[PDB]
Each structure stands twice: as structure tokens, then as C-alpha cells.
Specification:
part of a larger assembly, 2 chains, A: 50 residues, mainly alpha, B: alpha+beta, 1 helix, ATP synthase subunit alpha (chain B), ATP synthase subunit b-delta (chain A)
């Protein structure tokens, strides 16, 4: 749980810093596949699974 | 660093369907349709 909290805070920091990253991860598009693809691409191996 | 590549990749990736988000008295706003 502590690791989950820390990693969620880390991704919050990343989203705040990368405004463009936050804006595309936040677009209201119905298609989720592209978004998730950007996600893992930029963060999949750096954070736990949960 | 990897953000630029990662973000760029996204733009690149783009029978495609958009959705109306606003509508009124003749003007309608459609989210999506990246290739319109």
C-alpha cells in the first residue's frame, strides 16, 4: 500500500510536470487503446502492477 | 526526456467515429475525428 501511494504520487508529479502528457492522458476520447499505449510506453516497467 | 518520444508516438498513432459534445441552433461540436 505504501508503494502504491508513493507511485501514484509519482505519476501525479509526472502528469503535473508533463502538461502535454497529462492533456493526452486526459483527452475525452472514447478510444482507450491509444491512451493506454502511451501510458505503458512511458511508464510500464517503472511502476508496480497494482 | 522520453516524454517527447512518448508523446510524439502518441500523435503518430492516430471508419473513425467522433462524438457530439455540444449542440445548439445549428452549431455542433464533435470530439474525435482526428483525421477530418
Amino acid at each position: 500500500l505504501t508503494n502504491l501511494a508513493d507511485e501514484l504520487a509519482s505519476v501525479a508529479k509526472l502528469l503535473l510536470s508533463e502538461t502535454a502528457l497529462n492533456k493526452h492522458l486526459a483527452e475525452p476520447t472514447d478510444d482507450s487503446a491509444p491512451k493506454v499505449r502511451l501510458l505503458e510506453r512511458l511508464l510500464s516497467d517503472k511502476v508496480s502492477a497494482t | 526526456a522520453d516524454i517527447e518520444g512518448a508523446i510524439e508516438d502518441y500523435v503518430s498513432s492516430f471508419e473513425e467515429i467522433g462524438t457530439v459534445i455540444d449542440a445548439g441552433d445549428g452549431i455542433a461540436h464533435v470530439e474525435g475525428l482526428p483525421s477530418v
